[PDB]
Amino acid sequence: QDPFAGDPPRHPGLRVNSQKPFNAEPPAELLAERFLTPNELFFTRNHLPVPAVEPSSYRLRVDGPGGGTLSLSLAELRSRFPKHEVTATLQAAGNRRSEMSRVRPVKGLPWDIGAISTARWGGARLRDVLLHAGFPEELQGEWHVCFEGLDADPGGAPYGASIPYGRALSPAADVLLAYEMNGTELPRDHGFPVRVVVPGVVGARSVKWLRRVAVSPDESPSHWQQNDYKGFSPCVDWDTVDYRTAPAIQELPVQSAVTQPRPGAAVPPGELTVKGYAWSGGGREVVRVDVSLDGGRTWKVARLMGDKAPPGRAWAWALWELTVPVEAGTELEIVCKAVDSSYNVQPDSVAPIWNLRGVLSTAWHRVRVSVQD
Amino acid sequence: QDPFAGDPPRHPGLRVNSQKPFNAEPPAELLAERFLTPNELFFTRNHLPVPAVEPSSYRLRVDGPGGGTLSLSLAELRSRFPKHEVTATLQAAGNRRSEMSRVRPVKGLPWDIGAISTARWGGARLRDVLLHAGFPEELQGEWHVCFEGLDADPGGAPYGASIPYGRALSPAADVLLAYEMNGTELPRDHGFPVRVVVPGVVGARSVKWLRRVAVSPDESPSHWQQNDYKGFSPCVDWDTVDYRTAPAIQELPVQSAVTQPRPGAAVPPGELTVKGYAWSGGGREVVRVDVSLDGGRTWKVARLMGDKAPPGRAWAWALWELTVPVEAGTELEIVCKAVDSSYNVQPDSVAPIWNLRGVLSTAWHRVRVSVQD
Numbered sequence: 001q002d003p004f005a006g007d008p009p010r011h012p013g014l015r016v017n018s019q020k021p022f023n024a025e026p027p028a029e030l031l032a033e034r035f036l037t038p039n040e041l042f043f044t045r046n047h048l049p050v051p052a053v054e055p056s057s058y059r060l061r062v063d064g065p066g067g068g069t070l071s072l073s074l075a076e077l078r079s080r081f082p083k084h085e086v087t088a089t090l091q092a093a094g095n096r097r098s099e100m101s102r103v104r105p106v107k108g109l110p111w112d113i114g115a116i117s118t119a120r121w122g123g124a125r126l127r128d129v130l131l132h133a134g135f136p137e138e139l140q141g142e143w144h145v146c147f148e149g150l151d152a153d154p155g156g157a158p159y160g161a162s163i164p165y166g167r168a169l170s171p172a173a174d175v176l177l178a179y180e181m182n183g184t185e186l187p188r189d190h191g192f193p194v195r196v197v198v199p200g201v202v203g204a205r206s207v208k209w210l211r212r213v214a215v216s217p218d219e220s221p222s223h224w225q226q227n228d229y230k231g232f233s234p235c236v237d238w239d240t241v242d243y244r245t246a247p248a249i250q251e252l253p254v255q256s257a258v259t260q261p262r263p264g265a266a267v268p269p270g271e272l273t274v275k276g277y278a279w280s281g282g283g284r285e286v287v288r289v290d291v292s293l294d295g296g297r298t299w300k301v302a303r304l305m306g307d308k309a310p311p312g313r314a315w316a317w318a319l320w321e322l323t324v325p326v327e328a329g330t331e332l333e334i335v336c337k338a339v340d341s342s343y344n345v346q347p348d349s350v351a352p353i354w355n356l357r358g359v360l361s362t363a364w365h366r367v368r369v370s371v372q373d
Numbered sequence: 374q375d376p377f378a379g380d381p382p383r384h385p386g387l388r389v390n391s392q393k394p395f396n397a398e399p400p401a402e403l404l405a406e407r408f409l410t411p412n413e414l415f416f417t418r419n420h421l422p423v424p425a426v427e428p429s430s431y432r433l434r435v436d437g438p439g440g441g442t443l444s445l446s447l448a449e450l451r452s453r454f455p456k457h458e459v460t461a462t463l464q465a466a467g468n469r470r471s472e473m474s475r476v477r478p479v480k481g482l483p484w485d486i487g488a489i490s491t492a493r494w495g496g497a498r499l500r501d502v503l504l505h506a507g508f509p510e511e512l513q514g515e516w517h518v519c520f521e522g523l524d525a526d527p528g529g530a531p532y533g534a535s536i537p538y539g540r541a542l543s544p545a546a547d548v549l550l551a552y553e554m555n556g557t558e559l560p561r562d563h564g565f566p567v568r569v570v571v572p573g574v575v576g577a578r579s580v581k582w583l584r585r586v587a588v589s590p591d592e593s594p595s596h597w598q599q600n601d602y603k604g605f606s607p608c609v610d611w612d613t614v615d616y617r618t619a620p621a622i623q624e625l626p627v628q629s630a631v632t633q634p635r636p637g638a639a640v641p642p643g644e645l646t647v648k649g650y651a652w653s654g655g656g657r658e659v660v661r662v663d664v665s666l667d668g669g670r671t672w673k674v675a676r677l678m679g680d681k682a683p684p685g686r687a688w689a690w691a692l693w694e695l696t697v698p699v700e701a702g703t704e705l706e707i708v709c710k711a712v713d714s715s716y717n718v719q720p721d722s723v724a725p726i727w728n729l730r731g732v733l734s735t736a737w738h739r740v741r742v743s744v745q746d
């Protein structure tokens with residue numbers, strides 16, 4: 001009776017942590033090999049079966065201020081609104097969960113360093129769609145924009161998330177209703193025919209397979225806006241957790257990881273090129289990446305690849321690399337850490353950020369290797 | 374021949390690290406005793422002699438888009454523009470420098486935990502003054518607003534700093550040209566008759582004793598915008614430093630400190646109330662403060678005093694407190710650490726953020742005490 005029979009096929013080289021629903025990340029060897037992650041490798045994160053969508057009978061629902069409903073077809077979304085492109089990294093709340101479970105087991109998909117990818121998205125500006133539906137530039141008080149997807153659970157409830165009205169209306173926030181990804185139409189796994197893209201914020205809020213946009217006095221009433229995607233003290237456990245006591249994750253903290261070489265690898269002597277990525281929420285730029293060969297006692301500054309984005313609008317990761325000298329038969333512990341435009345930094349160790357749900361894993365990334373003789 | 378004879382007198386209980394120029398902080402016992410720091414205790418940071426200002430012949434200079442100059446008197450600044458009030462914490466770039474020098478000596482004023490204070494500022498909105506001078510809401514490209522103060526060095530050069538045009542024009546950024554502080558007129562030490570207040574950013578940019586506001590394609594050409602107030606890798610030293618390689622500090626990272634009890638104090642048994650402060654740049658709210666009694670192996674969540682500010686506009690610190698049980702003749706290492714609305718956190722230790730200039734000290738704050746028998 002398989003609810004997943006309809007799912008699309010995937011690239012055979014992904015690291016799959018869950019088949020049903022499908023949740024996988026690119027192999028770390030390939031993760032930072034390009035600045036734009038090819039579509040078929042882009043990390044994929046699904047809560048439910050992937051909806052089968054028939055393009056022409058597709059209608060996106062958008063309720064105007066007055067409770068009247070406007071309803072947009074896919075053709076009309078492409079032609080009513082000037083297409084805008086935005087290059088943005090999506091990062092799973094629980095990227096790097098693995099390292100947290102090493103300290104104490106947590107419940108969640110066991111992502112490694114790869115629950116993150118970058119793509120050039122293209123489509124309508126949400127701000128434009130809303131203005132078109134009749135909304136003003138500014139509402140009085142705290143308002144939220146709610147998205148529902150087409151995928152729902154056994155019992156009817158759709159996946160949903162929300163963002164602050166302000167962020168939705170802002171030209172600089174670049175919030176897209178994308179129908180293109182890396183120059184082609186949105187793949188099924190990635191939200192075909194339409195998804196929201198919220199630059200600078202946790203991946204959880206980029207609703208895929210979009211069916212509705214509502215404006216409201218409150219956050220998305222949904223399970224995943226309300227009872228998931230929050231960070232707690234390392235002391236909080238499954239009996240003590242109170243979801244009303246922490247804000248829903250929106251922006252993410254500064255983050256980086258070593259993608260080459262891999263743990264346990266033996267590398268040749270002379271010169272070693274260490275490569276990785278770094279990124280920060282909030283559209284805040286990565287301004288420096290320090291790398292260590294000795295477990296974080298001494299550091300050197302890595303080189304940042306990529307082109308500078310406007311101030312406040314660094315939605316894309318920075319890729320870094322650092323070529324250094326390595327001795328016959330030494331042991332290296334390779335550490336990296338990133339600093340952003342607000343000078344936020346990454347913490348030394350993992351225990352003090354541990355949280356029962358395994359999200360927000362951004363302590364320094366350590367990689368043990370040896371040098372052959 | 375004393376260039377400082379003219380300086381105002383101070384409160385006799387301040388912790389002075391430099392008499393000439395005057396640079397002092399409130400005693401830590403008093404630092405967090407109120408939410409608004411009384412004027413006479415507010416940390417004071419001067420590069421130069423304090424200018425003697427004659428109110429009525431005071432003119433603030435403001436150059437309109439066209440290179441023509443408008444020139445505002447103090448009366449006119451009070452009456453042309455609707456007074457707006459903003460409660461904001463100013464924090465020295467080098468707050469908590471002390472802890473950094475403990476690792477390796479640095480050059481700078483040796484601030485302890487107190488180079489920070491909060492006050493309700495009142496005065497003209499910079500955005501309004503600029504619009505009045507003729508500027509538009511939005512300029513094409515990256516533009517900067519430059520401030521000069523009345524205080525200059527032996528050889529003519531005034532203290533100066535700048536902020537992004539965007540931040541200056543934004544209603545939400547609350548950038549004030551203040552003439553009031555905690556309900557009275559600006560004290561001399563604190564900028565009388567006018568100072569800039571930039572919420573959410575390092576104290577360095579709140580030019581006191583304001584004489585000019587210029588709009589420009591570039592940052593403030595001044596020594597302190599260009600060759601100071603930047604963060605470097607812990608590897609960079611006095612011979613290797615390149616000031617063109619890091620951004621000028623604007624927003625600050627998440628920060629907290631224990632203000633009570635004090636290092637080396639012996640406290641009574643039974644119950645101990647630990648009090649402190651926490652704050653974050655960017656108008657990002659402090660959402661949690663964990664406190665440890667055992668040097669940071671186990672944590673408990675402190676209570677946050679204060680009232681929630683609008684989203685994105687938490688310019689004021691949060692004060693926290695936590696009452697816990699303490700045993701006869703134990704040793705405590707009290708640690709605190711804060712997490713903000715973007716979920717940025719504070720790093721475990723200081724060595725890995727060390728920088729040749731001692732700025733950006735935000736590793737966990739440790740406080741050793743004993744419990745009497």
Ligand SMILES: Nc1nc2c(c(=O)[nH]1)N[C@H]1C(S)=C(S)[C@@H](COP(=O)(O)O)O[C@H]1N2
Binds near residue numbers: 189
């Ligand atoms: N409809 C729908 N949209 C969704 C999800 C989902 O399960 N259903 N998952 C969200 C989460 S938690 C993440 S991290 C991103 C993953 O985006 P990607 O699958 O394109 O990498 O999708 C977001 N949008």
Ligand SMILES: Nc1nc2c(c(=O)[nH]1)N[C@H]1C(S)=C(S)[C@@H](COP(=O)(O)O)O[C@H]1N2
Binds near residue numbers: 420464564579
């Ligand atoms: N004219 C002038 N303005 C100035 C300074 C200065 O030396 N001269 N110091 C700046 C710095 S570095 C700081 S931290 C703040 C201190 O503000 P406070 O002295 O009111 O606490 O003033 C800022 N504005």
Ligand code: MOM
Binds near residue numbers: 092093115202203204
């Ligand atoms: O679960 Mo989505 O934030 O990876």
Ligand code: MOM
Binds near residue numbers: 418488
């Ligand atoms: O030097 Mo001012 O940032 O304390």
